[PDB]
Amino acid sequence: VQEIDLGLTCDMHVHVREGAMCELVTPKIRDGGVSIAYIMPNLQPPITTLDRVIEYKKTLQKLAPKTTFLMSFYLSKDLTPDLIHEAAQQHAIRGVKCYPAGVTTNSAAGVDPNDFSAFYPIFKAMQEENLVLNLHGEKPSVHDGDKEPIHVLNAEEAFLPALKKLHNDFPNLKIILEHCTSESAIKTIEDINKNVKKATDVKVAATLTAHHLFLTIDDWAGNPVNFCKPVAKLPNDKKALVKAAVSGKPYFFFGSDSAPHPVQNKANYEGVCAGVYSQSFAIPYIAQVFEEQNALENLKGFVSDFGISFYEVKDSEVASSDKAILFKKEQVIPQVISDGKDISIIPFKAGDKLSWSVRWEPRL
Amino acid sequence: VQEIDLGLTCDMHVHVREGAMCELVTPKIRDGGVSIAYIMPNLQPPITTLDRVIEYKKTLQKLAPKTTFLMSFYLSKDLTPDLIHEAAQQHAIRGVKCYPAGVTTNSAAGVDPNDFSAFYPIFKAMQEENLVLNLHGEKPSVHDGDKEPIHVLNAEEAFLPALKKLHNDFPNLKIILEHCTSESAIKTIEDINKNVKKATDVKVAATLTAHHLFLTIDDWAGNPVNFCKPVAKLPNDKKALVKAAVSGKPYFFFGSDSAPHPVQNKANYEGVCAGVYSQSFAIPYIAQVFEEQNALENLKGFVSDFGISFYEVKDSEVASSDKAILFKKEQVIPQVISDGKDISIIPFKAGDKLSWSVRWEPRL
Numbered sequence: 001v002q003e004i005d006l007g008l009t010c011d012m013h014v015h016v017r018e019g020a021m022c023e024l025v026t027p028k029i030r031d032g033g034v035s036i037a038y039i040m041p042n043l044q045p046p047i048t049t050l051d052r053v054i055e056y057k058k059t060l061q062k063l064a065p066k067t068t069f070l071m072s073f074y075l076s077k078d079l080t081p082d083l084i085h086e087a088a089q090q091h092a093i094r095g096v097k098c099y100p101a102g103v104t105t106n107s108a109a110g111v112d113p114n115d116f117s118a119f120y121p122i123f124k125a126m127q128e129e130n131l132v133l134n135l136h137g138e139k140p141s142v143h144d145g146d147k148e149p150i151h152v153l154n155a156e157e158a159f160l161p162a163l164k165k166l167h168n169d170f171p172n173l174k175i176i177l178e179h180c181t182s183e184s185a186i187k188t189i190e191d192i193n194k195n196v197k198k199a200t201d202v203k204v205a206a207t208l209t210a211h212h213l214f215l216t217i218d219d220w221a222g223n224p225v226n227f228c229k230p231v232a233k234l235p236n237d238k239k240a241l242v243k244a245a246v247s248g249k250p251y252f253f254f255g256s257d258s259a260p261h262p263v264q265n266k267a268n269y270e271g272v273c274a275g276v277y278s279q280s281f282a283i284p285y286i287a288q289v290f291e292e293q294n295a296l297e298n299l300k301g302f303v304s305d306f307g308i309s310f311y312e313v314k315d316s317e318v319a320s321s322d323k324a325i326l327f328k329k330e331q332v333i334p335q336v337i338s339d340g341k342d343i344s345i346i347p348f349k350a351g352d353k354l355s356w357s358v359r360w361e362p363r364l
Numbered sequence: 365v366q367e368i369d370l371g372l373t374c375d376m377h378v379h380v381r382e383g384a385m386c387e388l389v390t391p392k393i394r395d396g397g398v399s400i401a402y403i404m405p406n407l408q409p410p411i412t413t414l415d416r417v418i419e420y421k422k423t424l425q426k427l428a429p430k431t432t433f434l435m436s437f438y439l440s441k442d443l444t445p446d447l448i449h450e451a452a453q454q455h456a457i458r459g460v461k462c463y464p465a466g467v468t469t470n471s472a473a474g475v476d477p478n479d480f481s482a483f484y485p486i487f488k489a490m491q492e493e494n495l496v497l498n499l500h501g502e503k504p505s506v507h508d509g510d511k512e513p514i515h516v517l518n519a520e521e522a523f524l525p526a527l528k529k530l531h532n533d534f535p536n537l538k539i540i541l542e543h544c545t546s547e548s549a550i551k552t553i554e555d556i557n558k559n560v561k562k563a564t565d566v567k568v569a570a571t572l573t574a575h576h577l578f579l580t581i582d583d584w585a586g587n588p589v590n591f592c593k594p595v596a597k598l599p600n601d602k603k604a605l606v607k608a609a610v611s612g613k614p615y616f617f618f619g620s621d622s623a624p625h626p627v628q629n630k631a632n633y634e635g636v637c638a639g640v641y642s643q644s645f646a647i648p649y650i651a652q653v654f655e656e657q658n659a660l661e662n663l664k665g666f667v668s669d670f671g672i673s674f675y676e677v678k679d680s681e682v683a684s685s686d687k688a689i690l691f692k693k694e695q696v697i698p699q700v701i702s703d704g705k706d707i708s709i710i711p712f713k714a715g716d717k718l719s720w721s722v723r724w725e726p727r728l
């Protein structure tokens with residue numbers, strides 16, 4: 001069967017929770033074909049302290065010794081520039097993640113984004129320390145006057161001026177618009193990068209999830225298992241995301257936003273938790289998309305080369321040098337991912353067939 | 365005001381199901397402030413025979429002797445013009461409801477709205493007998509990859525040409541665009557009624573629900589209790605819907621589309637049943653909107669006059685002459701509506717407070 005050497009794969013947007021959920025999902029990073037994971041910090045309470053983020057990573061490394069973990073802080077008024085310099089000097093974080101208040105799980109108390117001024121001391125310190133600023137780029141919803149109303153469909157577009165102003169005010173800060181979902185955002189990222197030759201000049205990039213390469217509004221209208229933030233939008237948005245994924249441009253790379261929830265948190269009649277679980281088959285999901293687009297030769301850049309370059313992942317921090325190999329053996333997504341105890345998760349595209357599987361190969 | 369005499373109130377879009385659900389629901393039409401109800405036919409199996417529609421009405425009258433019941437057929441493969449004539453002269457039906465196949469609850473036996481042609485004989489017989497053609501005006505979803513995508517957000521607008529074509533081909537047939545949700549549909553209805561100024565001139569009307577005058581997409585995205593068909597759309601759409609409701613225009617009147625589902629059919633991780641249950645407080649929901657718009661003076665037309673006129677309801681058909689009196693005692697909506705056995709419903713805006721109650725006064 002056909003095979004594709006993908007090398008050291010990167011998922012630069014991972015949720016792994018705590019407790020028994022973390023013990024279930026953290027080994028699945030490797031199982032899904034991912035060597036390097038960027039760990040998001042929206043725990044309860046958020047990660048805003050150095051000892052917390054040190055312990056968390058060590059807990060993850062214990063659960064999965066072959067996986068390379070890049071950590072983050074949650075953007076909070078609790079952060080100080082001193083805490084940034086210290087954490088960055090100790091290699092305890094690689095970036096800081098911004099959640100606008102109220103917009104997704106564990107996002108209030110995050111921040112309001114027609115502002116960001118109050119966090120300029122933090123960004124300054126991050127810029128100095130070469131830390132990445134990650135953005136859940138959605139403006140909070142507003143329906144009354146005066147302005148044009150903000151809702152789950154235009155909230156990403158409405159965020160794009162904040163993105164531009166941040167890039168303007170901090171031209172040397174690395175910034176990521178996480179999990180892009182709209183055509184408008186894709187074009188904004190390309191227009192920000194119009195003068196870029198060679199990958200190493202990219203200062204603003206965007207990540208793309210597996211599930212937004214498949215879903216539109218119709219897939220989650222009536223199916224909480226497909227409901228996430230930002231919400232999957234219109235077919236034209238989906239087309240633009242897939243084109244960007246297969247484009248070979250260095251400012252689009254893979255981040256799953258795999259966000260696990262126990263099934264009973266998805267089958268609520270009110271307050272469904274947002275989040276789609278894709279960790280267990282992360283790279284096969286993507287392979288499905290690159291195959292259907294006749295773009296397999298661009299797979300390696302999207303799930304490996306470009307994320308490593310943007311984050312400057314050194315071989316010396318890599319926990320395992322095994323390479324992820326895709327091999328074209330068909331498989332069936334299970335109905336549930338379970339720990340055999342109190343946790344069942346519905347995986348993305350549960351029940352469906354995937355053309356590809358992943359295995360691991362020693363280097364040299 | 366305090367106390368408004370709404371007369372013989374009209375809800376021209378009602379679902380009461382069968383069995384224990386029906387026993388719980390059909391008394392609440394009255395309790396909700398409604399005198400005249402138009403009963404939709406999407407039972408299992410669909411209501412498509414004379415004996416069934418007669419026995420159904422008989423069951424409903426026993427459960428609520430003072431409610432006026434206007435009945436309907438389900439637009440079916442099995443219907444014939446002979447049955448339309450026979451059921452019309454026996455006054456067993458007042459209209460026929462069209463469901464497009466698969467767009468909503470119990471629509472799997474519905475039609476293909478791209479080709480209505482095989483139902484033109486049914487529509488010619490309805491036109492003779494002065495029966496009403498109700499339309500759930502949405503096209504089924506088409507993702508396709510060639511012709512225009514149809515999805516839950518443009519599926520109503522995509523249906524508008526079909527509506528104009530049926531109006532053109534049957535100019536004397538009373539037709540209703542049920543539960544309008546978009547500004548485009550408001551404009552097409554206002555359009556078709558360019559040169560009608562009161563009231564009996566109207567041939568093509570549209571009903572507006574309680575929930576669509578409150579809801580936007582933000583309210584049902586993570587809340588299945590607010591999920592219904594057609595889906596609630598953008599703030600710009602709800603603004604057109606609300607302005608159309610308090611408009612005093614005779615081509616807009618109240619139809620609740622109260623659609624009860626047991627709470628287990630809403631707390632699903634997939635296949636959430638579509639439907640908002642608003643029967644228990646229908647008139648007070650509407651009152652709140654007209655109050656906030658400073659337009660109580662048009663409440664009587666929206667909730668009584670225009671529906672009685674368009675359906676040509678006669679005093680001789682009315683099961684009780686009691687008048688719906690709207691009085692301003694605050695009430696708090698329950699968290700649950702229950703029969704005390706197996707059935708529980710989450711009502712619309714559960715836990716919220718309404719400014720108005722409604723009671724029944726006789727005519728003397």
Ligand SMILES: [Zn+2]
Pocket residue numbers: 104136178179229230257
């Ligand atoms: Zn996010």
Ligand SMILES: [Zn+2]
Pocket residue numbers: 013015040257259
């Ligand atoms: Zn995330």
Ligand SMILES: [Zn+2]
Pocket residue numbers: 468500542543593594621
């Ligand atoms: Zn309907």
Ligand SMILES: [Zn+2]
Pocket residue numbers: 377379404621623
């Ligand atoms: Zn209905």
